[PDB]
Design brief:
Cystine Knot Cytokines, subunit B; Beta-nerve growth factor (chains A, B); dimeric; beta-nerve growth factor; two-stranded antiparallel ribbon; growth factor; homodimer; 58% strand
């Protein structure tokens, strides 16, 4: 049947406490946002790698005879209400969204 | 050097007009949100496949002798201000976030 090259794990996250923002700083993630007198809990759908090597040689199916590989998590950016040592603001934060295979040549 | 198995293309999108929501319906994406008397244009960072077959056999580096492959775009969910035939609301919409390789056995 069909299976990815890198095994992946997805979960809805409703209790996030810190995240790295687009500018690289660590920021605190607030839990509920009120947008116009009504509140929302902030949720993030994240997908992570289950393993950098789901198989001993790296990613599944790769041609190991020529290639080296491992799986790695890639990120999107989602704006969220956050706060830092001085200011609460909507900021863009890095969220984990996929597990992909990266290759290079064996020598 | 390091290269992905599936070639990928990322862009910030600031003029999105429709999106499919989590419930599957097509919805209209509004452009500016006012959260507390101040406005924001809504942006989405999307990553798409450049090709289902970046190489003639499917994804790069796969062992084609045993495997069939192609690249496919995976989605995250981002909440955005949207509207439908009756109601403007924050809804979760499907955003394209990665290009990953899917395998199956050749016979």
């Amino acid at each position: 049947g069909e299976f990815s090259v890198c095994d992946s794990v997805s979960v809805w996250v409703g209790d996030k406490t810190t995240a790295t923002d687009i500018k690289g700083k660590e920021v605190t993630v607030l839990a509920e946002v009120n947008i116009n007198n009504s509140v929302f809990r902030q949720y993030f759908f994240e997908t992570k790698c289950r393993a950098s090597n789901p198989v001993e040689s790296g990613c599944r199916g790769i041609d190991s005879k020529h290639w080296n590989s491992y799986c790695t998590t890639t990120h999107t950016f989602v704006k969220a209400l956050t706060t830092d040592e001085k200011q609460a603001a909507w900021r863009f934060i890095r969220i984990d969204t996929a597990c992909v295979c990266v290759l290079s040549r064996k020598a």
